[PDB]
Ligand binder design. Structure first.
Ligand code: SF4
Length: 83
């Protein structure tokens, strides 16, 4: 079950970025964002995931202030975690 502050499918920014809590139900292949092949991309390996926010599988994303994403999710702002 998601947390009360989870990013949801109805959030305008989530819609614009094509976020899904489950990267296997995402359009990562169509987007072909650079840095890894698309099937390898999800929030856990994204530069914007905040590992010190949230708990368990539900972590922060810098782009979604006050909310939580799932580490197994994806959106079109996916960017390789480089530091
Ligand atoms: S920016 Fe990165 S961490 Fe945030 S929802 Fe998109 S893929 Fe996940």
């Amino acid at each position: 079950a998601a947390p009360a502050n989870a990013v949801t499918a109805d959030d305008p920014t989530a819609i614009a970025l094509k976020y899904n809590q489950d990267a296997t139900k995402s359009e990562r292949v169509a987007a072909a964002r650079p840095g890894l092949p698309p099937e390898e991309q999800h929030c856990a390996n994204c530069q914007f995931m905040q590992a010190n926010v949230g708990e368990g599988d539900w972590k922060g994303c810098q782009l979604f202030p006050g909310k939580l994403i799932n580490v197994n999710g994806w959106c079109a702002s996916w960017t390789l975690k480089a530091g």
